[PDB]
Amino acid sequence: GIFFPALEQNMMGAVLINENDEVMFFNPAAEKLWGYKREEVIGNNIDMLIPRDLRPAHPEYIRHNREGGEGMSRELQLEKKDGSKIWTRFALSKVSAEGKVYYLALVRDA
Amino acid sequence: GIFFPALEQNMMGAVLINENDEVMFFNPAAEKLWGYKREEVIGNNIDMLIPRDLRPAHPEYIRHNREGGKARVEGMSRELQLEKKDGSKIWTRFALSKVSAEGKVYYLALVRDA
Ligand code: HEM
Ligand code: HEM
Protein backbone atom coordinates (compact mmCIF):
# COMPACT_ATOMS: atom_id res chain seq x y z
CA GLY A 1 0.00 0.00 0.00
CA ILE A 2 1.07 3.56 -0.78
CA PHE A 3 0.01 4.48 2.75
CA PHE A 4 3.07 3.03 4.47
CA PRO A 5 5.48 4.97 2.20
CA ALA A 6 3.37 8.09 2.69
CA LEU A 7 4.08 8.02 6.42
CA GLU A 8 7.55 6.47 6.29
CA GLN A 9 8.86 9.15 3.93
CA ASN A 10 6.85 11.98 5.49
CA MET A 11 8.51 15.30 6.27
CA MET A 12 6.62 15.21 9.57
CA GLY A 13 7.78 12.97 12.38
CA ALA A 14 5.32 10.12 12.83
CA VAL A 15 4.88 8.09 16.01
CA LEU A 16 2.24 5.38 16.25
CA ILE A 17 1.41 3.59 19.50
CA ASN A 18 -0.68 0.45 19.97
CA GLU A 19 -3.38 -0.48 22.48
CA ASN A 20 -0.70 -1.06 25.14
CA ASP A 21 0.97 2.31 24.50
CA GLU A 22 3.99 0.65 22.90
CA VAL A 23 5.62 2.43 19.95
CA MET A 24 4.96 0.42 16.79
CA PHE A 25 6.07 2.94 14.14
CA PHE A 26 8.71 5.67 14.37
CA ASN A 27 9.79 7.20 11.05
CA PRO A 28 13.11 8.86 10.07
CA ALA A 29 11.67 12.35 10.63
CA ALA A 30 10.87 11.30 14.19
CA GLU A 31 14.41 9.97 14.59
CA LYS A 32 15.76 13.41 13.66
CA LEU A 33 13.40 15.21 16.04
CA TRP A 34 14.03 13.02 19.13
CA GLY A 35 17.62 11.95 18.51
CA TYR A 36 16.67 8.27 18.86
CA LYS A 37 17.07 5.55 16.23
CA ARG A 38 13.89 3.54 15.66
CA GLU A 39 15.87 0.55 16.95
CA GLU A 40 15.91 2.23 20.39
CA VAL A 41 12.17 2.96 20.32
CA ILE A 42 10.15 0.30 18.50
CA GLY A 43 8.47 -2.07 20.92
CA ASN A 44 9.18 0.15 23.91
CA ASN A 45 6.78 2.28 25.97
CA ILE A 46 5.64 5.74 24.86
CA ASP A 47 6.99 6.91 28.23
CA MET A 48 10.53 7.02 26.85
CA LEU A 49 9.50 9.73 24.36
CA ILE A 50 7.82 11.95 26.97
CA PRO A 51 9.86 14.79 28.52
CA ARG A 52 11.13 13.73 31.94
CA ASP A 53 9.18 16.45 33.75
CA LEU A 54 5.95 15.28 32.09
CA ARG A 55 6.42 11.54 32.61
CA PRO A 56 4.50 11.82 35.90
CA ALA A 57 1.39 13.30 34.25
CA HIS A 58 1.30 11.90 30.73
CA PRO A 59 0.24 8.32 31.59
CA GLU A 60 -3.07 9.53 32.97
CA TYR A 61 -3.63 11.77 29.96
CA ILE A 62 -3.60 8.71 27.69
CA ARG A 63 -5.46 6.39 30.07
CA HIS A 64 -8.32 8.82 30.53
CA ASN A 65 -8.64 9.34 26.79
CA ARG A 66 -8.66 5.59 26.10
CA GLU A 67 -11.38 4.78 28.63
CA GLY A 68 -14.51 6.82 28.03
CA GLY A 69 -13.92 7.48 24.35
CA GLU A 70 -10.69 12.90 19.09
CA GLY A 71 -7.93 15.02 17.60
CA MET A 72 -6.05 18.23 18.31
CA SER A 73 -3.01 20.28 17.25
CA ARG A 74 -0.89 22.48 19.52
CA GLU A 75 2.74 23.29 20.27
CA LEU A 76 4.68 21.09 22.68
CA GLN A 77 8.21 21.21 24.05
CA LEU A 78 10.02 18.04 23.00
CA GLU A 79 12.98 16.67 24.95
CA LYS A 80 15.61 14.86 22.89
CA LYS A 81 17.68 11.85 23.91
CA ASP A 82 20.58 14.13 24.86
CA GLY A 83 18.40 16.33 27.05
CA SER A 84 18.19 19.34 24.76
CA LYS A 85 14.69 20.70 24.16
CA ILE A 86 12.99 22.12 21.08
CA TRP A 87 9.54 23.54 20.44
CA THR A 88 7.39 21.61 17.99
CA ARG A 89 3.79 21.30 16.87
CA PHE A 90 1.93 18.03 17.42
CA ALA A 91 -1.10 16.85 15.45
CA LEU A 92 -2.52 13.96 17.50
CA SER A 93 -5.07 11.54 16.02
CA LYS A 94 -7.02 8.74 17.70
CA VAL A 95 -7.12 5.74 15.37
CA SER A 96 -9.65 2.93 15.77
CA ALA A 97 -8.94 -0.27 13.85
CA GLU A 98 -9.88 -3.92 14.25
CA GLY A 99 -11.42 -3.27 17.65
CA LYS A 100 -8.30 -1.60 19.03
CA VAL A 101 -7.43 2.02 19.84
CA TYR A 102 -4.16 3.45 18.51
CA TYR A 103 -2.79 6.97 18.42
CA LEU A 104 -0.71 8.62 15.72
CA ALA A 105 1.23 11.79 16.46
CA LEU A 106 2.46 13.83 13.51
CA VAL A 107 5.23 16.23 14.51
CA ARG A 108 6.73 19.35 13.00
CA ASP A 109 9.57 21.61 14.14
CA ALA A 110 8.34 24.90 15.64
CA GLY B 1 -2.69 -2.64 8.05
CA ILE B 2 -2.78 0.36 10.39
CA PHE B 3 -1.17 2.88 8.02
CA PHE B 4 -4.33 3.43 5.99
CA PRO B 5 -6.53 3.98 9.09
CA ALA B 6 -3.91 6.32 10.55
CA LEU B 7 -4.27 8.63 7.54
CA GLU B 8 -7.97 8.02 6.91
CA GLN B 9 -8.93 9.03 10.47
CA ASN B 10 -6.28 11.71 10.83
CA MET B 11 -7.19 15.14 12.18
CA MET B 12 -5.06 16.56 9.36
CA GLY B 13 -6.48 16.76 5.86
CA ALA B 14 -4.64 14.37 3.56
CA VAL B 15 -4.37 14.61 -0.23
CA LEU B 16 -2.33 12.10 -2.21
CA ILE B 17 -1.67 12.64 -5.90
CA ASN B 18 -0.08 10.17 -8.30
CA GLU B 19 2.51 10.49 -11.08
CA ASN B 20 -0.08 12.21 -13.27
CA ASP B 21 -1.11 14.69 -10.57
CA GLU B 22 -4.47 12.96 -10.09
CA VAL B 23 -5.93 12.60 -6.60
CA MET B 24 -5.86 9.00 -5.38
CA PHE B 25 -6.70 9.64 -1.71
CA PHE B 26 -8.68 12.46 -0.06
CA ASN B 27 -9.66 11.87 3.58
CA PRO B 28 -12.65 13.19 5.59
CA ALA B 29 -10.56 15.94 7.18
CA ALA B 30 -9.71 17.19 3.68
CA GLU B 31 -13.41 17.05 2.80
CA LYS B 32 -14.11 19.49 5.64
CA LEU B 33 -11.25 21.82 4.72
CA TRP B 34 -12.10 22.15 1.01
CA GLY B 35 -15.85 21.57 1.08
CA TYR B 36 -15.71 18.78 -1.50
CA LYS B 37 -16.87 15.20 -0.99
CA ARG B 38 -14.06 12.76 -1.78
CA GLU B 39 -16.10 11.18 -4.59
CA GLU B 40 -15.97 14.59 -6.32
CA VAL B 41 -12.17 14.69 -6.16
CA ILE B 42 -10.86 11.16 -6.70
CA GLY B 43 -9.32 10.68 -10.13
CA ASN B 44 -9.27 14.40 -10.93
CA ASN B 45 -6.24 16.60 -11.50
CA ILE B 46 -5.02 18.40 -8.37
CA ASP B 47 -5.90 21.60 -10.25
CA MET B 48 -9.44 21.53 -8.82
CA LEU B 49 -8.02 21.95 -5.30
CA ILE B 50 -5.80 24.91 -6.17
CA PRO B 51 -7.09 28.48 -5.70
CA ARG B 52 -8.44 29.70 -9.05
CA ASP B 53 -6.04 32.63 -9.34
CA LEU B 54 -3.10 30.27 -8.77
CA ARG B 55 -4.21 27.45 -11.08
CA PRO B 56 -2.32 28.85 -14.07
CA ALA B 57 1.02 28.81 -12.25
CA HIS B 58 0.83 25.79 -9.91
CA PRO B 59 1.32 23.06 -12.57
CA GLU B 60 4.80 24.31 -13.41
CA TYR B 61 5.88 24.20 -9.78
CA ILE B 62 4.89 20.55 -9.46
CA ARG B 63 6.54 19.71 -12.79
CA HIS B 64 9.72 21.54 -11.78
CA ASN B 65 9.90 19.63 -8.51
CA ARG B 66 9.28 16.30 -10.24
CA GLU B 67 12.07 17.00 -12.71
CA GLY B 68 14.30 18.21 -9.87
CA GLY B 69 14.78 14.86 -8.16
CA LYS B 70 15.25 16.36 -4.69
CA ALA B 71 14.00 14.30 -1.74
CA ARG B 72 12.61 17.08 0.46
CA VAL B 73 10.03 19.60 -0.74
CA GLU B 74 11.02 23.08 0.44
CA GLY B 75 8.07 25.02 -0.93
CA MET B 76 4.64 25.57 0.59
CA SER B 77 6.36 26.08 3.94
CA ARG B 78 4.34 29.03 5.26
CA GLU B 79 0.67 29.77 5.94
CA LEU B 80 -1.39 29.74 2.74
CA GLN B 81 -4.94 30.69 1.83
CA LEU B 82 -7.07 27.71 0.80
CA GLU B 83 -10.09 28.30 -1.45
CA LYS B 84 -13.16 26.23 -0.58
CA LYS B 85 -15.74 24.90 -3.03
CA ASP B 86 -18.05 27.81 -2.19
CA GLY B 87 -15.28 30.28 -3.00
CA SER B 88 -14.55 31.38 0.57
CA LYS B 89 -10.97 31.41 1.89
CA ILE B 90 -9.36 29.99 5.03
CA TRP B 91 -5.78 30.15 6.32
CA THR B 92 -4.00 26.80 6.39
CA ARG B 93 -0.62 25.21 6.96
CA PHE B 94 0.63 22.49 4.58
CA ALA B 95 3.18 19.74 5.21
CA LEU B 96 4.23 18.56 1.73
CA SER B 97 6.05 15.27 1.25
CA LYS B 98 7.48 13.65 -1.87
CA VAL B 99 6.69 9.94 -1.77
CA SER B 100 8.66 7.52 -3.93
CA ALA B 101 6.88 4.22 -4.46
CA GLU B 102 6.40 1.73 -7.27
CA GLY B 103 9.02 3.54 -9.32
CA LYS B 104 6.67 6.51 -9.30
CA VAL B 105 6.72 9.92 -7.64
CA TYR B 106 3.64 10.74 -5.55
CA TYR B 107 3.03 13.77 -3.37
CA LEU B 108 1.17 13.75 -0.06
CA ALA B 109 -0.12 16.99 1.39
CA LEU B 110 -1.08 17.05 5.07
CA VAL B 111 -3.17 20.11 5.89
CA ARG B 112 -4.57 21.88 8.94
CA ASP B 113 -6.60 25.04 9.48
CA ALA B 114 -4.37 27.84 10.75
C1 HEM C 1 7.40 15.53 22.95
C2 HEM C 1 6.45 14.58 23.42
C3 HEM C 1 5.12 14.70 23.95
C4 HEM C 1 4.66 15.69 24.82
C5 HEM C 1 5.45 16.89 25.39
C6 HEM C 1 3.26 15.44 25.10
C7 HEM C 1 2.46 16.25 25.90
C8 HEM C 1 1.10 16.05 26.19
C9 HEM C 1 0.29 16.93 27.00
C10 HEM C 1 0.73 18.22 27.72
C11 HEM C 1 -0.98 16.38 27.03
C12 HEM C 1 -2.21 16.94 27.77
C13 HEM C 1 -3.23 17.47 26.79
C14 HEM C 1 -2.93 18.88 26.33
O1 HEM C 1 -2.20 19.04 25.33
O2 HEM C 1 -3.41 19.82 26.98
C15 HEM C 1 -0.92 15.17 26.22
C16 HEM C 1 -2.02 14.32 26.01
C17 HEM C 1 -1.97 13.17 25.22
N1 HEM C 1 -0.87 12.71 24.53
FE1 HEM C 1 0.97 13.49 24.55
N2 HEM C 1 2.81 14.28 24.44
C18 HEM C 1 3.92 13.84 23.73
C19 HEM C 1 3.88 12.71 22.91
C20 HEM C 1 2.77 11.88 22.68
C21 HEM C 1 2.84 10.74 21.76
C22 HEM C 1 4.10 10.31 20.96
C23 HEM C 1 1.57 10.17 21.79
C24 HEM C 1 1.07 9.03 21.08
C25 HEM C 1 1.12 8.73 19.70
C26 HEM C 1 0.77 10.99 22.72
C27 HEM C 1 -0.56 10.77 23.03
C28 HEM C 1 -1.33 11.55 23.88
C29 HEM C 1 -2.73 11.30 24.17
C30 HEM C 1 -3.60 10.15 23.66
C31 HEM C 1 -3.13 12.30 25.00
C32 HEM C 1 -4.53 12.49 25.59
C33 HEM C 1 -5.23 13.48 24.67
C34 HEM C 1 -6.57 13.96 25.20
O3 HEM C 1 -6.62 14.44 26.35
O4 HEM C 1 -7.56 13.86 24.43
N3 HEM C 1 1.52 12.05 23.25
N4 HEM C 1 0.34 14.98 25.71
C1 HEM D 1 -4.86 25.26 -0.98
C2 HEM D 1 -4.10 24.65 -2.03
C3 HEM D 1 -2.74 24.83 -2.48
C4 HEM D 1 -2.10 26.05 -2.63
C5 HEM D 1 -2.66 27.47 -2.34
C6 HEM D 1 -0.76 25.81 -3.10
C7 HEM D 1 0.15 26.81 -3.36
C8 HEM D 1 1.44 26.65 -3.81
C9 HEM D 1 2.38 27.72 -4.07
C10 HEM D 1 2.13 29.23 -3.91
C11 HEM D 1 3.55 27.13 -4.51
C12 HEM D 1 4.83 27.81 -5.04
C13 HEM D 1 5.57 28.58 -3.96
C14 HEM D 1 6.06 27.71 -2.83
O1 HEM D 1 6.81 26.74 -3.09
O2 HEM D 1 5.69 27.99 -1.69
C15 HEM D 1 3.30 25.69 -4.50
C16 HEM D 1 4.28 24.72 -4.86
C17 HEM D 1 4.06 23.32 -4.85
N1 HEM D 1 2.88 22.70 -4.50
FE1 HEM D 1 1.22 23.60 -3.94
N2 HEM D 1 -0.51 24.43 -3.28
C18 HEM D 1 -1.71 23.83 -2.89
C19 HEM D 1 -1.91 22.45 -2.89
C20 HEM D 1 -0.96 21.50 -3.26
C21 HEM D 1 -1.24 20.07 -3.21
C22 HEM D 1 -2.59 19.45 -2.77
C23 HEM D 1 -0.06 19.44 -3.64
C24 HEM D 1 0.25 18.05 -3.79
C25 HEM D 1 -0.16 16.93 -3.03
C26 HEM D 1 0.89 20.52 -3.92
C27 HEM D 1 2.20 20.33 -4.37
C28 HEM D 1 3.14 21.33 -4.63
C29 HEM D 1 4.51 21.10 -5.08
C30 HEM D 1 5.18 19.74 -5.34
C31 HEM D 1 5.09 22.33 -5.21
C32 HEM D 1 6.53 22.63 -5.63
C33 HEM D 1 7.28 22.94 -4.33
C34 HEM D 1 8.80 22.82 -4.40
O3 HEM D 1 9.34 22.61 -5.51
O4 HEM D 1 9.44 22.93 -3.32
N3 HEM D 1 0.33 21.79 -3.69
N4 HEM D 1 2.01 25.41 -4.08
Curated annotation (Swiss-Prot), chain A:
Full protein name: Oxygen sensor protein DosP
Other facts: Binds O(2) with a dissociation constant of about 74 uM.
Subunit description: Homodimer; has been previously suggested to be a homotetramer based on size exclusion chromatography. Forms a complex with DosC.
Residues of the whole record sequence present: 12 to 125 of 799
Outcome of substituting residue 74 to A/E/I: The Fe(2+)-O(2) form loses c-di-GMP PDE activity, due to reduced O(2) affinity and/or increased auto-oxidation. NO and CO forms are less affected
Domain of life of the source: Bacteria
Post-translational modification: The heme distal ligand is coordinated by Met-72 in the active Fe(2+) (ferrous) form, by O(2) in the O(2)-bound form and by H(2)O in the inactive Fe(3+) (ferric) form.
Functional note: Heme-based oxygen sensor protein displaying phosphodiesterase (PDE) activity toward c-di-GMP in response to oxygen availability. Involved in the modulation of intracellular c-di-GMP levels, in association with DosC which catalyzes the biosynthesis of c-di-GMP (diguanylate cyclase activity). Cyclic-di-GMP is a second messenger which controls cell surface-associated traits in bacteria. Has very poor PDE activity on cAMP but is not active with cGMP, bis(p-nitrophenyl) phosphate or p-nitrophenyl phosphate.
Annotated positions binding heme: 58, 72
Domain PAS as annotated: residue spans: 1-69
Record organism: Escherichia coli (strain K12)
Comment block on domains: The EAL domain (residues 532 to 799) is a cyclic dinucleotide di-GMP (c-di-GMP) PDE hydrolyzing c-di-GMP to 5'pGpG; it has no activity on cAMP.
Induction, as annotated: Expressed in the late exponential growth phase and at higher levels in the stationary phase. A member of the dosCP operon. Expression is RpoS dependent and is higher at 28 degrees Celsius than at 37 degrees Celsius.
Effect of substituting residue 64 to A/G: No loss of heme binding
UniProtKB/Swiss-Prot annotation, chain B:
Segments forming domain PAS: 1-70
Mutation effect (residue 64 to A/G): No loss of heme binding
Subunit text: Homodimer; has been previously suggested to be a homotetramer based on size exclusion chromatography. Forms a complex with DosC.
Protein name (record): Oxygen sensor protein DosP
Post-translational events: The heme distal ligand is coordinated by Met-76 in the active Fe(2+) (ferrous) form, by O(2) in the O(2)-bound form and by H(2)O in the inactive Fe(3+) (ferric) form.
Result of altering residue 80 to T: Increases auto-oxidation
Record remark: domains: The EAL domain (residues 532 to 799) is a cyclic dinucleotide di-GMP (c-di-GMP) PDE hydrolyzing c-di-GMP to 5'pGpG; it has no activity on cAMP.
Function noted in UniProt: Heme-based oxygen sensor protein displaying phosphodiesterase (PDE) activity toward c-di-GMP in response to oxygen availability. Involved in the modulation of intracellular c-di-GMP levels, in association with DosC which catalyzes the biosynthesis of c-di-GMP (diguanylate cyclase activity). Cyclic-di-GMP is a second messenger which controls cell surface-associated traits in bacteria. Has very poor PDE activity on cAMP but is not active with cGMP, bis(p-nitrophenyl) phosphate or p-nitrophenyl phosphate.
Highest taxon, organism lineage: Bacteria
Miscellaneous comment as given in the Swiss-Prot or TrEMBL entry: Binds O(2) with a dissociation constant of about 74 uM.
UniProt-annotated binding residues for heme: 58, 76
Induction conditions: Expressed in the late exponential growth phase and at higher levels in the stationary phase. A member of the dosCP operon. Expression is RpoS dependent and is higher at 28 degrees Celsius than at 37 degrees Celsius.
